[model samples]
Target: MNYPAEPFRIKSVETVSMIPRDERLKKMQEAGYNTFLLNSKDIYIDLLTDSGTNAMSDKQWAGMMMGDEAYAGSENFYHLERTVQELFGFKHIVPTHQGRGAENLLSQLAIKPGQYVAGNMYGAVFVDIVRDEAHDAGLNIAFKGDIDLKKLQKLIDEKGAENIAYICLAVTVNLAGGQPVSMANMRAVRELTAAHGIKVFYDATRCVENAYFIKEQEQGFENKSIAEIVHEMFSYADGCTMSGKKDCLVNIGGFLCMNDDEMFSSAKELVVVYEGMPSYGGLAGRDMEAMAIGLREAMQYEYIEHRVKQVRYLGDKLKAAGVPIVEPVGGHAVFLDARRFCEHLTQDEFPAQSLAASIYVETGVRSMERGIKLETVRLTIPRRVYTYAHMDVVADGIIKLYQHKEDIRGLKFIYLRFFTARFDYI
Candidate 1:
């Protein structure tokens, strides 16, 4: 079917109220004209993020009820561990409160003073954590652009393998419009890094979605299962840090996994101090159980197929309406190219932020800007939530906003630039 249908039916409901245009304008202004600051009740369609915003399946909920709450050795933890080991092919699984926690653990464990970490388009939050942690540890960081094999090779060559730490690869490059790194590119990265004894650690937050893209787009992988593709993808990497909130389809929890025995031992020890017990990490038994179920459910072909198609559906609508967006709509979100959408505004004026604000005022559809250099607004679709009708509403809002694009004002950053950055409409 051209229009993909939802694989499951909704058994539960949540009510939301949309504020009037005048009220939305007032609310937006009060929140410093930032979508992140707006109250959820005041918005119509929430597209701020996919993180921890998904609707859990009945199966996941059932798993949650079966949680074994023992502190030292929860059965749920073992279930989660086995799932991670089977799917990711990692030897040890160390749970965390969220993906950033895993990143923090990896940073402290892997990075040394004066060492370099390289990658392309790590998310804003992760990039900040990695950079800050690297700075505190007196480490250097490098970027070579997304999917550029030559640039990555050249970067490693210039930096010298001995001084370089692991390469941090985010499967679906979030900031670069939720773009996926191809299997070939990943293999090339693995080959180059392996020769120099450097590790390739994945920011595997959206790896399953990346795998789905690989199945659909890449040649010679058309017949492979999502789980099979997932195993191969992780096999290329030494280890990974994950957020259960994204691909795992859980609200809260994450993990760090690896093969090195010494690294695993150190992580187990550090996890106790930083997160929680090695068995439970920072997550409760129930959360671990739900995550275990989520991990399995996420790999199902039917679910992932609908998930990517829904995002593509919205992307197609916006594209047909003459909207500017990231080419080849991404796995999880449709990133609107705000620079082209609001050509009258400059990067200094914060065009993406302004575009997001205007859309909110026009239709109460909340979105976030990629900020500063990127100048794009992201419309992220939550899993098993929202129908094609909701997407139509979002499309109508953006189209209406685009029709009056000239009236959409620019913005000036006031404090704490990006994320919590306060802005005044220009």
Candidate 2:
């Protein structure tokens, strides 16, 4: 189902009024405001970086240049241990270059090919890496949606628990239109997965926001703190991976923290090859410091609240424009449905890719295409921005594009290198 042509009319967008300052501010901050690195003076906003772009206080940055962790076994590793334990109650936290690295290591070490992995939904790269590993080992990979308990049980019944490596729960459920799996849902998933003797791992890249939302939306959770909710959720997982770039509010680093020693030890052995020592893992000391502080800070209620609202605000505006977006928006992004947005185009033609290109040219705001291009179009809110005060800028741009939607042509595909190594063209 695609958006109605009338909704994209220029006049429809022009007449739409933005909500006032307080509403906008509140909304902006809720959506991970700090990640944008918006300069009050400059019109340009940097939307990259998942963890709010390196929280390296001036002191930390300078310390790195002076050779803080140059030889390894530096204080930085200790800092990671202390921080991980303090924040997540995990004793064995492994460092990785980014989230995908952690996912790769975990998938390789934990599950073999022809095995099944059950997850709510995962980032595309995470899925690719895991499936690729499975392919090499001659294992089959299965990803169960958040609500598909029957499917999980069916797989377990057929393959037995030993055949399943882990049941992963993606915090923000990225592939499910960025919709979150509630705490209750998470607990349910954990219970069922555990009953089947399958370990649970959380891909907690957008966990901070999910934690905040969980507290608000779940029953008997209104009084509970975000930290309490986070800790409880972590308690359910045997291990977890975070793209410190996003929720950690740090720039350019990621970590894989494990609650089980056996799992950590097994993964660490492999990490030594692809990543460096368990302590450093190809990231600098400064990045380590940034990730540590950012991880703790990101879980703070004040910060998470700001990010949540910002995303909802962006979602609200798009919804008002009658755009077909993923409902009940989650932490990091507002997902535009490519299938619905470009009903005029066919899957083979790549409508989502065309929509992404249009969004960039129309708004000068670079948004990711999440669908079949990747799978859908995702408009991500940066974690550093002060508020959605400038979100109107983005919304206004989207409006302009919608106005010219008719003028825009349907998308067509150009070729690129896909996974040609294994899968050959027929």
Candidate 3:
């Protein structure tokens, strides 16, 4: 496969070395079989989640030098606020440490006990409105993660509209192999929710990528600019919670933005409790400056174009070698179907979990397990971080490891979030 030429040039480099297979296995054992616990030194190419692992450009670094550290009103915060408003046209911007923090503010501001979200951890239970076909990667579908209108309206009919909080729609749904929601679906979802007077809040972390997919897959959008498409997409939603670390191309920072004056007032107040003062919100001024710069940089067609191409480039490599992968490829990463890869292991046996460890031990590429319904191992490629050669290394490792997948074993886990969770062979 021909890889797209990179749009930017590398300014700095980091050196990483691979150890012997036996040594890698022993080190994995030392970390209790969890790749997260292993030191960065042990990892050859980290394919762990793409949260904050971005390769920021020189422009972003230069912006970081202009950080205003004032507690009340920082110049950097205003710049970030200005950028977000210019792009998405939201009236207010409440900066946070990351995406989760923004969610916390929104959840605290809106959700009550019985209210349902179309997604995440708030006081209310989130209903899965994504169509069943979304999970079937083998199936041919344009938008796997699009919300099911019938299922959603049925849920609304079952539960009184008075009890509903807001719709938290994650564009390019990450769990469904970073698949996108169709724009037609977005308009329909917005219309249905509007009839019920419900707010539509998007988890717009990857909306830029979603727009790219829409431009490629959907009819009538072949001519829309990525920024214009993004603006049009968000026009249907009341607001969004964003992690700058993802599409914003920054190493840190996030925001909760809205058009509602009352709700905006409420977010500013609640944000004080969890994320600190409304201005800083658990982020350094420098991070906000870089995030602001990254946001504009990400909206460019060439940036997203090359980024998605690189992801597909890696996915195609794996697929060509007969590896089972999420079909159509995703915008951010390549997902390996761990269930197909390791049929010998069961759900409770943590097949995907064990496969990740096995890959790391055998080949030095570090990947993490999705381990939910699909039992996928996500090879999250950080934005502009690794080269095509690095992807080839990852592909080579997985292809070689697949030859001996039967040797991979199940794992038993202990502890907190997957980041903190430890495991050993079962």
Candidate 4:
């Protein structure tokens, strides 16, 4: 089949409204022309993000009902711990409300003054926490030029291994247009970091999706199942931080998994102080139960295949229509190269934001803009929530916007820069 069939059928649905064009324009203006600020009720197709926006299965819902409410040593927590250990092979599992909570706890334990943390472009929230923690601890941060192993090695060499802290490797580099890091490259990084006595910490947010790409695009992994590829992927890493919201297919949950007993001990202590008791780190028993099921469900070959293929379908369609997008299509979203799409606009003019605004006005399809590195607009696909028909609507909207590209204006930021950044058309 050109497009993989949905692994399971949808038993229920929620209706979404497509407001009138004039109403959308008014709502867009009221929200300072920012898609992030618009209410969910006003959006027809919400492509703003995939984080915590996935559609969970009936099994996951049943698991939620089975949540153990004990404040300490909940039964659900043990199920989550066992599930993580079985799939990820991590000796210790610490649950958190979301990924950043784990990142915060991990940063506090690992980062030190005058040390450097290296990785590719991180998500806005990830960058904020890492940078803030690094600053407070008097540490430095480095980006190793996408997923180039040589550049990463060079950074370690120049900075000296002792001066560098752990290497932060994000599977499916989010900011680089959801690009996947090859298995060979990951193994090479693991070897290089191991030789230098530096730990390789993985941001395994979309790792299952990354594994699907490996199964399709990389060698020696074609015959392997998604779970096998996922297991091996973590084997190369010393430990990992996960936002269970994405690949886990849950609304809210995350974890920090590690093998080092000493570090794990320290992390457990911090979890008590910053998050919660060792048993349930900032999450309830029900959340833990759901997360356990979501973890296994995310690794299913049919589910992953369908998820990634959906993204590829939309990306392929856009590319065929001469829309400039990040090539090789990343796992979760189609990133449009806004600089090329809106050649008449410049960085200072905010081409990415402008394209997002135009798309919303044309069709109440919400999207996000990455103006930091390369100006681009991201159409993030939420797992099992949208269909091929929905993708066609998005493509049609984008195509229509492109036809009037010259009329698209730029934006000027007025408030908090990224998430709550209010914009005025320029």
TM-score of every candidate relative to the true structure = 0.89, 0.75, 0.92, 0.89
Q: Least accurate stretch of 10 residues (summed lDDT) in model 2?
A: 1-10
Ranking by TM-score: 3, 4, 1, 2
Clash totals, every prediction:
0, 44, 0, 0
What would the per-residue lDDT of candidate 3 be over residues 97-144, giving only the tens digit for each residue?
889888888888888877778742116777888887776777767788
Which regions in candidate 1 have their CA more than 4 angstroms from the true location? 122-147, 273-279, 348-350, 410-426
In the range 145-217, model 1's lDDT, one tens digit per residue, is: 1446566677667768866667888877675445666788788889988998998899999998888888987
Candidate achieving higher TM-score, 3 or 4: 3
Top candidate when judged by lDDT against the true structure: 3
Local error of candidate 3 at 13, Å?
0.9
Model 1 scores a C-alpha lDDT of 0.81
Task: Write out the backbone clash pairs for model 3.
Answer: none
lDDT of each: 0.81, 0.61, 0.84, 0.81
Ranking by lDDT: 3, 4, 1, 2
Which window of ten consecutive residues has the lowest lDDT sum in model 3? Answer: 114-123
After TM-score superposition, the amount by which residue 241's alpha carbon in candidate 4 deviates from its true location, in angstroms, is 0.7
Tens digits of per-residue lDDT for model 4, 1-426:
588978989977979886888999999898888888889999999998889889988998898888889887679988998999999999988888889988887888888866777776451112221222211111112221235566666777776887766888888777544666678877887888899898888999999988888898787789999999999999998899999999999999899999999998898887666545455666888889988999899888999999989998998888888888765576788888899999999888989887988899888899988743467888988889998898998999898777778889888876656778888888
